[PDB]
Write an enzyme that holds these catalytic residues in place. Sequence first.
Site, mmCIF file in Angstrom:
data_model
loop_
_atom_site.group_PDB
_atom_site.id
_atom_site.type_symbol
_atom_site.label_atom_id
_atom_site.label_comp_id
_atom_site.label_asym_id
_atom_site.label_seq_id
_atom_site.Cartn_x
_atom_site.Cartn_y
_atom_site.Cartn_z
ATOM 1 N N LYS A 57 35.458 38.076 35.836
ATOM 2 C CA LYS A 57 35.790 36.660 35.927
ATOM 3 C C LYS A 57 35.477 35.935 34.619
ATOM 4 O O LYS A 57 35.203 34.731 34.621
ATOM 5 C CB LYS A 57 35.058 36.017 37.106
ATOM 6 C CG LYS A 57 35.475 36.578 38.471
ATOM 7 C CD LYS A 57 36.879 36.157 38.842
ATOM 8 C CE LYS A 57 37.332 36.787 40.157
ATOM 9 N NZ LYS A 57 38.633 36.233 40.582
ATOM 10 N N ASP B 191 34.047 32.492 44.498
ATOM 11 C CA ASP B 191 35.453 32.824 44.315
ATOM 12 C C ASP B 191 36.007 33.478 45.583
ATOM 13 O O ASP B 191 35.427 34.427 46.087
ATOM 14 C CB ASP B 191 35.602 33.758 43.115
ATOM 15 C CG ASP B 191 36.972 33.673 42.477
ATOM 16 O OD1 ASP B 191 37.985 33.630 43.215
ATOM 17 O OD2 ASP B 191 37.037 33.657 41.229
ATOM 18 N N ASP C 258 36.314 37.144 46.474
ATOM 19 C CA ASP C 258 37.670 37.318 45.997
ATOM 20 C C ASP C 258 37.985 38.773 45.702
ATOM 21 O O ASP C 258 38.983 39.311 46.177
ATOM 22 C CB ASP C 258 37.891 36.501 44.734
ATOM 23 C CG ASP C 258 39.275 36.670 44.199
ATOM 24 O OD1 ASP C 258 40.201 36.177 44.874
ATOM 25 O OD2 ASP C 258 39.451 37.325 43.142
ATOM 26 N N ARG D 84 50.461 33.905 33.332
ATOM 27 C CA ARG D 84 49.014 33.782 33.401
ATOM 28 C C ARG D 84 48.356 34.715 32.376
ATOM 29 O O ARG D 84 48.781 35.865 32.205
ATOM 30 C CB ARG D 84 48.531 34.082 34.824
ATOM 31 C CG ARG D 84 47.032 34.065 34.952
ATOM 32 C CD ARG D 84 46.562 33.965 36.398
ATOM 33 N NE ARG D 84 45.254 34.598 36.501
ATOM 34 C CZ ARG D 84 44.483 34.605 37.579
ATOM 35 N NH1 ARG D 84 44.841 33.954 38.680
ATOM 36 N NH2 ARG D 84 43.329 35.253 37.531
ATOM 37 N N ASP E 294 49.001 40.032 45.036
ATOM 38 C CA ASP E 294 49.434 38.671 45.357
ATOM 39 C C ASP E 294 50.523 38.708 46.424
ATOM 40 O O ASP E 294 51.053 37.673 46.802
ATOM 41 C CB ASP E 294 49.950 37.953 44.102
ATOM 42 C CG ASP E 294 48.925 37.946 42.984
ATOM 43 O OD1 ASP E 294 47.728 37.730 43.264
ATOM 44 O OD2 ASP E 294 49.305 38.171 41.823
ATOM 45 N N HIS F 257 45.235 35.835 48.349
ATOM 46 C CA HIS F 257 44.593 34.566 48.610
ATOM 47 C C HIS F 257 45.185 33.946 49.861
ATOM 48 O O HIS F 257 46.185 34.423 50.411
ATOM 49 C CB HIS F 257 44.809 33.633 47.428
ATOM 50 C CG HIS F 257 44.220 34.149 46.156
ATOM 51 N ND1 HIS F 257 44.441 33.544 44.935
ATOM 52 C CD2 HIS F 257 43.418 35.212 45.915
ATOM 53 C CE1 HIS F 257 43.801 34.221 43.995
ATOM 54 N NE2 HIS F 257 43.176 35.239 44.563
ATOM 55 N N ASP G 164 37.374 28.038 44.615
ATOM 56 C CA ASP G 164 38.626 27.701 43.942
ATOM 57 C C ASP G 164 39.858 27.902 44.839
ATOM 58 O O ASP G 164 40.916 27.344 44.569
ATOM 59 C CB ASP G 164 38.769 28.521 42.639
ATOM 60 C CG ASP G 164 38.572 30.026 42.838
ATOM 61 O OD1 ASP G 164 37.968 30.485 43.852
ATOM 62 O OD2 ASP G 164 39.041 30.795 41.957
ATOM 63 N N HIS G 165 39.700 28.707 45.890
ATOM 64 C CA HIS G 165 40.752 29.037 46.858
ATOM 65 C C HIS G 165 40.122 30.029 47.831
ATOM 66 O O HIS G 165 39.066 30.603 47.540
ATOM 67 C CB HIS G 165 41.937 29.727 46.169
ATOM 68 C CG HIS G 165 41.535 30.957 45.427
ATOM 69 N ND1 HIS G 165 41.354 32.177 46.044
ATOM 70 C CD2 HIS G 165 41.209 31.140 44.126
ATOM 71 C CE1 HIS G 165 40.942 33.060 45.150
ATOM 72 N NE2 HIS G 165 40.850 32.457 43.978
ATOM 73 N N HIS H 148 40.494 41.179 47.953
ATOM 74 C CA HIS H 148 41.742 41.765 47.446
ATOM 75 C C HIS H 148 41.913 43.239 47.805
ATOM 76 O O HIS H 148 43.011 43.775 47.686
ATOM 77 C CB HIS H 148 41.855 41.619 45.914
ATOM 78 C CG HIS H 148 42.260 40.256 45.436
ATOM 79 N ND1 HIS H 148 43.485 39.689 45.722
ATOM 80 C CD2 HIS H 148 41.618 39.378 44.636
ATOM 81 C CE1 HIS H 148 43.579 38.513 45.117
ATOM 82 N NE2 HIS H 148 42.449 38.293 44.468
ATOM 83 N N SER I 216 42.583 31.581 40.825
ATOM 84 C CA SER I 216 41.457 31.346 39.939
ATOM 85 C C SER I 216 41.807 30.622 38.642
ATOM 86 O O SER I 216 40.984 29.879 38.107
ATOM 87 C CB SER I 216 40.834 32.678 39.588
ATOM 88 O OG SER I 216 40.224 33.306 40.704
HETATM 89 MN MN LIG Z 1 39.623 32.974 42.461
HETATM 90 MN MN LIG Z 2 41.887 36.547 43.717
#
Ligand SMILES: [Mn+2]
Ligand SMILES: [Mn+2]
Length: 509
Positions: free
Chosen positions: A331, A12, A398, A257, A153, A458, A439-440, A402, A62
């Site tokens: 997760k 991730d 991930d 989400r 974000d 991200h 995933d990114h 962050h 994600s």
């Molecule tokens: Mn992710």
């Molecule tokens: Mn993330």
Amino acid sequence: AGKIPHVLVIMDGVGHREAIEDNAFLAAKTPNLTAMKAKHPNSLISGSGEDVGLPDGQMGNSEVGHMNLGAGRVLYQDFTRITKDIRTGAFFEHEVLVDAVEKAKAAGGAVHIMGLLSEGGVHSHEDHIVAMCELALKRGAKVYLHAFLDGRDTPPRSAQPSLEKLDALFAQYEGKGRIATMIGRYFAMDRDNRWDRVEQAYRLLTEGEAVRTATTAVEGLELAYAANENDEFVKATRIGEIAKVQDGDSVVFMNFRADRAREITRAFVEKDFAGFERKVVPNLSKFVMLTRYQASIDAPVAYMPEELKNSLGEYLSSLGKTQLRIAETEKYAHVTFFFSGGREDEYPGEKRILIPSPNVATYDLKPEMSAYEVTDELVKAINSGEYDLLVVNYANGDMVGHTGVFDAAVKAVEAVDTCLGRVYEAVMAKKGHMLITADHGNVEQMQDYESGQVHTQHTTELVPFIYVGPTQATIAEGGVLADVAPTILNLMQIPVPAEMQGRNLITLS
Ligand SMILES: [Mn+2]
Ligand SMILES: [Mn+2]
């Protein structure tokens, strides 16, 4: 037992960026990944923008990523759907949203709107929140906005223009609406059962209970910044007079989400809520979830999810095959209902192992997180021969990316690399197949040159795609996340279901 294992490893937040500056992936010691890439075929695939059904330039995430990985097709996203409805005007006539407003008006109450207030676009978008506020204001309602501040974000200090945008909207309907409270998403949008955090947001909304008061939203933000709080971690702040969410009011939660919306939603609506002892529980005229955060939550939903048939997990279950989903608890959604395409319960033949994430404030304090225990269990599972498919998420890149802390992000990558050495050993010994991908991106850019702040978000970078198996192979260029499931099915020598639209990327030699 005796099954050939097929392992999907999702690192991730680990992307591929050629630039060295502020790249925590390249700075890390990654001897296992380096060795694997030297020996085995590897490529890059895309998990951002139009390749995953998002707008051009929008970073992956994600939810979208694991849904695409599991589905073997590009999905029409709720972000797109809601944005379209606002564009066409359909949003403003939405029966569920209109009903929330009309019920509050009939009770002589207010419409309370809450959600992540930023342009991030991962959990919400402030333009959707403007639209919901306008919907209510134009229907003559009293409107209070409860802002959940971002910094995760979006840049770690970036809330001011969003607050100003909403102030400006309310100024157009003078005396009818205002920003009532602000709190960091760390509190309002927890997803790992840290109920002490959720309670702070809940008490702010239901009691006006705050660490600080301010006369305006921007003054409130300035007070937080002076207290050395960044947006994500802003403590409960009340603007002006107490404006409680109370009996007869309606609440509209504007996040689209699910994973980070469940906990605060349950605090309001769950009959026998046990996360914490609630001091006040309002009897609302209506609570609206913008999308379906959890099937078992007894509250209306504005945008219900499309049916998704024959995701990889469902299809393998339909064939009587077995599968493992494993990750740490941060997760959970990712390897369960995101990967399954929306289904929350295990499929027949599906087992889940969720290792508790560390009980720390922020993951830069323990960049290895719970990866070593995840790996202990994954290796045991692979060696057992009990699973046809094993899906693992390593959260580290991930989660530590962050934080915006470069040195910690380097250590997170190193932890994942060490773990992957053990996974590799087990797969090779069982003559199995493994795809290592993501995933990114995230960790590969730790400085944000656009703002001068550390990079807590991200990226839009491509992600690695490594094929480990008993033989060599060639991998086609131009792959996307939707191609992963058809590729896995080809490795398994199982026909691809009609519902999948992606392509097989791997040609064995
Ligand atoms: Mn992710
Ligand atoms: Mn993330």
